[PDB]
Amino acid sequence: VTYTFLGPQGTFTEAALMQVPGAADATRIPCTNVNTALERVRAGEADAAMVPIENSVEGGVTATLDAIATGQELRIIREALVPITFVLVARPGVELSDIKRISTHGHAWAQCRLWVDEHLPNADYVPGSSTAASAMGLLEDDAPYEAAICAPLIAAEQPGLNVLAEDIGDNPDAVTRFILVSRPGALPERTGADKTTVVVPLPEDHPGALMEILDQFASRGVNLSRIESRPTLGHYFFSIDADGHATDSRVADALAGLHRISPATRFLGSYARADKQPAVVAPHTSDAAFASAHAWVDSILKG
Amino acid sequence: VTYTFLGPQGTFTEAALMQVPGAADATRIPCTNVNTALERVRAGEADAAMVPIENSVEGGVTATLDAIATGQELRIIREALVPITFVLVARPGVELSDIKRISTHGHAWAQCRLWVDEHLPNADYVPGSSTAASAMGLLEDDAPYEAAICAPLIAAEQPGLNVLAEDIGDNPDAVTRFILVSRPGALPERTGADKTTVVVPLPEDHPGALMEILDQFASRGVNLSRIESRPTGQYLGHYFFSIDADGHATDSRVADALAGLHRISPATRFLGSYARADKQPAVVAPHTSDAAFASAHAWVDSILKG
Amino acid sequence: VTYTFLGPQGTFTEAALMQVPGAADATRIPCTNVNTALERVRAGEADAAMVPIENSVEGGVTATLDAIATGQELRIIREALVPITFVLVARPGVELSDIKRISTHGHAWAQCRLWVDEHLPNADYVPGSSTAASAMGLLEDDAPYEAAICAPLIAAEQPGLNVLAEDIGDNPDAVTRFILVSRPGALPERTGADKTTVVVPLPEDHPGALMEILDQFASRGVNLSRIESRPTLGHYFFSIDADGHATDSRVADALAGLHRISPATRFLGSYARADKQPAVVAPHTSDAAFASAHAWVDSILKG
Amino acid sequence: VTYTFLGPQGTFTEAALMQVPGAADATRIPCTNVNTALERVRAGEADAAMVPIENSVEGGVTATLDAIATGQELRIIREALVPITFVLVARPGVELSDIKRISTHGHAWAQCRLWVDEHLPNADYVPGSSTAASAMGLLEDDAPYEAAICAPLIAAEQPGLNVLAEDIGDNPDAVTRFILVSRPGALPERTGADKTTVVVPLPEDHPGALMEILDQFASRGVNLSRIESRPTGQYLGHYFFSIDADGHATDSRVADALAGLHRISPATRFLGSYARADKQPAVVAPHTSDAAFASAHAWVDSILKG
Ligand SMILES: N[C@@H](Cc1ccccc1)C(=O)O
Ligand SMILES: N[C@@H](Cc1ccccc1)C(=O)O
Ligand SMILES: N[C@@H](Cc1ccccc1)C(=O)O
Ligand SMILES: N[C@@H](Cc1ccccc1)C(=O)O
Ligand SMILES: [Mg+2]
Ligand SMILES: [Mg+2]
């Protein structure tokens, strides 16, 4: 079992990957970008890729959204919501008062403003490429900064890095959502708290065209948790997360409705919700209701 | 083979039954009212009942809509659209100048205004129970009127009735819609020019509730030709909707819509699929053909099974 | 103040009219049919016409529905829900056991079946034109029946008619709904439990065309209590009763929406509900919500 | 006149600001991030901020979507669609054979694969914070790489930077969408080819909730060109929707839609009406013209007042 991820080593993305069951003791390959992590999977060199999909402090989200929606034959098999905790690290013997410059990824920098502005008002920012690269950069004697903002992972992995501050994020409950992406296989088992992702191409652009797509879910009691339009036909695709599993009668039926409107629709997997909240199923929308209605129609058709 | 129909004999209703193939030589039983007509079918004592459902010269329409919405299951197997022609009728020897009083059903009267005002301006309307009864009343001694407005049928059948004026109605396009109703059996063969009728009880009364029911048809490209709400104490939404859709129950979009209806309202009644009197084919919208439905099912199957 | 009604005198329709405030002591003109009652009003000879619209035991409903929907310049100014109580009447000295034949309107006959089948199983039916005409027919010595089913009004008006049975209807709570129709004037005052009627022509016949019409009400929290399609353009009109008064912001706005789709839409009046049940107004649909939203748009437009 | 933009200098973002009329001779302040850019505008210290909103070679897009959805009111006054052209850059004397390491923003790297794999198959990517920083890093002693991928802008401005390869991107149609954002003032004049942007907080999370919001546009013939949901803890539905519609706030169908949105969600933010970069006029659907709206208002008025 081999996983790729958005590298380098010790980023928030790897930290997320290591909480996946068995991944702490699996082979984890850092890739320089989402496409390469994804190519490895597509080429059979890796079983799955761990990539950010919401609120990454390393960047990478838009590239993930591009990749799953313009790609071919990929399935999301797992998601993860990982609390972000920022630490400030420096080389041993460097005190808080010695810090004149701090390197990190721009996303992390923006999220730690209150702490830094209060506790290090004389510290100026040095743009980094990732939090991990900013941290590893300290290990060079000539580094052009004195501290970095990074994940607790990197701080505990590196004996040459000392934590000077912990939990310095503006929001203590901030989270990144990640997805684990593999080649198509069997559908993960339904848990009752599941999510389904599709990418729906727009056949014709006119008012109410999205409405028509959205209705396939809504008329069937299927809640949505994410929607994004992307210019690419009607010149758009819609990337959509829905509550439920392809196995649920209401969801299977919504998928059929989607295909009829847009037969190039892509299925991106059904998988367990990281939040473990089961869909509240309206009774007229239940598996039993679908079976009862189909049985009633059959009795007419065969009467 | 036994038919019932809304009586008495000689009404526009009978005339309509008379047009159904084989009926002229079949047993035709006139019944007092629509319920009595249907009752006989439900009880196993008649094969089908011919009842009006729109623009009845004799009344009976609301009775029909309520009767088919409750009780033993029934199916519409045929519809008829019968052109309405009115004749003015009287005993032999009676001329236009001799008419002071005219009896007919109020529905007939209201449609013969133009001719009557023009040619019998001094004549008074005497309300009748049906066109046929009005006509038959003339064969009695000292009938309290001198003319009747009725169907050509009853004039042709009664020797004592003379036609004083032909085709006296206000509306050239006037037609009555009838339905022939039986106990449930097989669906007839689809034709591509079919109608499907359902009665949908409202489960819960709120804005957009009907829209939710109508969307089952609209979202699957199913055109409607009739909707009517009716109060009722049987449903906890307090209404039912009587609906005619374009299509046959076996058409994939229609079967699918029917399933959607049952999910919202499990007490939905299926009232049959049957050929359109006017023979006009359903227009099948994009994405809603049997083929599109089958492609979509196969796609979902590949996901489930792959 | 002069009213017409669906005659003759002593029908359930007149009984309904006499419960209208001041009508018991107004001039009430019986008309042989709905059109004539309506012509009188249209010609200025009568102020209003009382005609049945739901569950008439005298007939007349479909003619009412035809008239208000194909007519010109008429407004419904009042509705009434009148409990139906049937009485069986005969000439003095005629006993229950003397009744061989009963005349009434077909609608009344169908609604009294249980009583008659139990209490008079030997009585056969004689079709009548109205319950009142059936009753008045007894006053002739040569009448071809012995009893009639009619309104309590006719029974109490006519000293020559004796009640032999009362409340013989299958349903003790059965009701007829009637409407009072006048020429256009000022809108009746809003009560908070109001109804509005329109007739909407269908511009084009296609799936979802009615949906579009219905949405104008639904998207604005406006409940409907009656809908009927009629073949007559799209070849239909829709006769519609909605909850609310034209004065309510959500209703005025629904009316505007209707006009845009179908500019030949006819307004048939706003008037008090006979059931006196106030609409439950969703907060985002309230007059205050409409005023707040319009004020917010104005601040943008004028900023 | 003072602009801020997502820095540093020489990025694709600056190049885009540079295209706005009068900007080449205006004060242009580079800012660390999107929030800092907007902050300056909000504080009264800059007139407008130029920030990316789609397909940014430099990042910044999610920052933009979140920043304009909360806090002090802002308005988009202009949008720009800027074609992306990549150059390969190095110090003088350095040739293709001399390159083992290339630095750029990951977004640039991912779009230059074809050319790089073909012509520099042995070169390794060194991730940079921005294209500009990658380029500027080459002017330093013993930079840990030998080439950068950046905008033509920074190559033209830096003497120490030599263009080794021109136009090396994978996608001919690649463009970045930017927005120029100011404090609220007057609506600009409508053109018939306008865009309107709003941010709509979800009040309550249930199936069809978004549909209810989208229907405000769809039921009034208003076409959409962008929708994005974003999580947030501020709304009790837990999301907001970022939306671009075809039209100008003064168009009757748009003002009407805006009112519908406010009724559902009173905390709706108005983000401006502004000319479309591509100059494509709104198509005005049947029944939705200013004239139709005015006829309908006048009809309702006749009822109210008559
Ligand atoms: N869950 C709601 C709102 C929503 C839509 C899309 C994305 C996020 C939330 C719906 O299905 O309509
Ligand atoms: N056929 C149209 C309009 C219509 C509806 C119902 C009855 C008659 C006509 C539709 O399906 O919406
Ligand atoms: N009151 C519901 C259902 C209904 C519709 C039409 C007539 C009667 C009832 C609605 O507005 O949708
Ligand atoms: N323009 C179409 C589809 C669309 C919606 C939203 C974003 C992009 C495209 C509509 O208004 O429904
Ligand atoms: Mg350490
Ligand atoms: Mg008496």
Specify the experimental method. X-ray
Q: Which pair of structure tokens corresponds to residue A135?
A: 């941290």
Stated length of chain B: 306
Pairing state between β C2-6 and C27-31: parallel
Pairing state between β D87-90 and D162-166: antiparallel
Return the DSSP state at D178: E
CA-to-CA distance for A111 and C211, rounded, in angstroms?
48
Q: Which pair of structure tokens corresponds to residue D16?
A: 């885009």
Chain C residue numbers touching D293 (CB-CB < 8 A): 256, 260
CA-to-CA distance for C5 and C16, rounded, in angstroms?
10
The residue among B37, B61, B51, B65 whose CA lies nearest residue B232 is B65
CA-to-CA distance for D28 and D7, rounded, in angstroms?
10
Chain D residue numbers touching C187 (CB-CB < 8 A): 303-304, 306
What number of other Cβ atoms are within 10 A of residue D110's Cβ?
Answer: 20
CA distances to B153, B180, B219, C6 from B281, in Å: 32, 21, 19, 42
Q: Which pair of structure tokens corresponds to residue B177?
A: 């819609």
CB C90 within 8 A of CB C136: no
Q: What are phi and psi of A75, to 5 degrees?
A: -130, 140
Q: Which residues of A are annotated as a binding site for Mg(2+)?
A: 155, 158, 161
Pairing state between β A2-6 and A48-54: parallel
Please state whether at least 3 CB pairs lie below 8 Å between chains B and D. no
Nearest to D207 among A34, A217, A227 (CB): A217
CB C148 within 8 A of CB C128: yes
The residue among B13, B38, B3 whose CA lies nearest residue B133 is B13
Q: Is A65 on the interface with D (CB under 8 A)?
A: no
Look at residue C284 and give its three-state secondary structure: helix
The residue among D20, D91, D88, D71 whose CA lies nearest residue D49 is D20
Q: Best interface-test mutation with C: which of B13, B131, B224, B226 has the largest number of C CBs within 10 A? A: B224
Q: Which residue has tokens 């959204």?
A: A65
C155 is in an annotated binding site: yes
The residue among C184, C185, C199, C287 whose CA lies nearest residue C242 is C199
Q: Is C33 on the interface with B (CB under 8 A)?
A: yes
Is the backbone peptide bond immediately before C8 cis, with ω within 30 degrees of 0?
Answer: yes
| Helix, strand, coil shares, percent, chain B, to 5 | 30, 30, 40
Pairing state between β B239-246 and B194-201: antiparallel
Q: Work out the minimum CA distance from C303 to partner chain B, whole angstroms.
A: 36
Q: Best interface-test mutation with C: which of B9, B13, B33 has the largest number of C CBs within 10 A? A: B33
Which residues contact residue C200 at a Cβ distance below 8 angstroms, ignoring those fewer than 6 apart?
C213, C237, C238, C240, C258, C262, C265, C266
Q: How far is the centre of ligand 5, averaged over its atoms, from the C-alpha of A149 (Å)?
A: 13
CA-to-CA distance for D137 and D123, rounded, in angstroms?
17
Stated length of chain D: 306
Q: Which pair of structure tokens corresponds to residue B106?
A: 């109020």
Q: Report the DSSP beta bridge partners of residue B50.
A: B5, B180
Q: What is the DSSP string of B182-210?
A: E-S-PPPPP-SSEEEEEEEE-SS--TTHH
CA-to-CA distance for C100 and C96, rounded, in angstroms?
9
Q: Can you give the resolution of this entry in Å?
A: 2.0
- Return the residue of C nearest to B219 by Cα: C208
Using CB distances shorter than 6 Å, the residues near ligand 3 are: B 202, 205, 207-211, 229, 239; C 223-227
CB A268 within 8 A of CB A74: yes
CB A247 within 8 A of CB B304: yes
Stated length of chain C: 303
Look at residue D107 and give its three-state secondary structure: helix
Q: How far is the centre of ligand 3, averaged over its atoms, from the C-alpha of C217 (Å)?
A: 10
* Contact state of D210 with A214 under an 8 Å Cβ cutoff: yes
- Closest ligand by atom to D210 CA: 1
CA-to-CA distance for B269 and B198, rounded, in angstroms?
6
Give the relative orientation of helices C249-261 and C209-218 as an angle to the nearest 10 degrees: 160
* Contact state of A184 with B306 under an 8 Å Cβ cutoff: yes
Q: Which residue has tokens 């006149």?
A: D1
Q: Work out the minimum CA distance from D68 to partner chain C, whole angstroms.
A: 17
Q: In what order do the strands lie in the sheet with A27-31?
A: A27-31, A2-6, A48-54, A175-182, A75-83
CA-to-CA distance for D276 and D280, rounded, in angstroms?
7
CA-to-CA distance for A232 and D174, rounded, in angstroms?
11
What number of other Cβ atoms are within 10 A of residue C252's Cβ?
Answer: 23
Count of H-run helices and E-run strands, chain D: 10, 14
* Contact state of C296 with D262 under an 8 Å Cβ cutoff: yes
Breaks (C-N over 2.5 A) in chain A follow: 232
CA distances to B220, D144, D286 from C55, in Å: 34, 91, 40
Q: How far is the centre of ligand 3, averaged over its atoms, from the C-alpha of C223 (Å)?
A: 6
Q: Is D287 on the interface with C (CB under 8 A)?
A: yes
Return the DSSP state at B24: G
CA-to-CA distance for A191 and A278, rounded, in angstroms?
8
* Contact state of B33 with C106 under an 8 Å Cβ cutoff: yes
Q: Is A283 on the interface with B (CB under 8 A)?
A: no
CB A250 within 8 A of CB B246: no
Q: Best interface-test mutation with C: which of D73, D251, D303 has the largest number of C CBs within 10 A? A: D303
| Torsional class of B98: left (φ above 0), alpha (ψ -120 to 50), beta (otherwise) | alpha
Q: How far is the centre of ligand 1, averaged over its atoms, from the C-alpha of A15 (Å)?
A: 29
- Closest ligand by atom to A279 CA: 1
Q: Is D184 on the interface with C (CB under 8 A)?
A: yes
Chain D residue numbers touching A57 (CB-CB < 8 A): none
* Domains in chain D with CATH codes: 1-84+174-185 (3.40.190.10), 85-173 (3.40.190.10), 186-283 (3.30.70.260), 284-306 (6.10.250.500)
Q: Which residue has tokens 């909407």?
A: C200
Q: What angle do CA C185, C190, C192 make, to 5 degrees?
A: 155
Using CB distances shorter than 6 Å, the residues near ligand 2 are: B 223-227; C 202, 205, 207-211, 229, 236
CB B242 within 8 A of CB B227: yes
CB B184 within 8 A of CB A303: yes
Please state whether at least 3 CB pairs lie below 8 Å between chains D and A. yes
The residue among B127, B102, B86, B123 whose CA lies nearest residue C31 is B127
CA-to-CA distance for A24 and A296, rounded, in angstroms?
52
The residue among C212, C262, C215, C263 whose CA lies nearest residue C242 is C215
**Rg of chain C over all Cα atoms, to the nearest angstrom:** 23
Burial degree of D189 (CB within 10 A; 0-12, 13-18, 19+): exposed
| Torsional class of B303: left (φ above 0), alpha (ψ -120 to 50), beta (otherwise) | alpha
Q: Report the DSSP beta bridge partners of residue C160.
A: none
Stated length of chain A: 303
Helix or strand holding residue C51 (H, E)? strand C48-54
CB C100 within 8 A of CB C123: yes
Count of H-run helices and E-run strands, chain B: 10, 14
Pairing state between β A27-31 and A2-6: parallel
Q: What angle do CA A123, A128, A134 make, to 5 degrees?
A: 80
CA distances to A113, B238, D26 from D39, in Å: 13, 58, 19
Q: Which pair of structure tokens corresponds to residue C276?
A: 């006196």
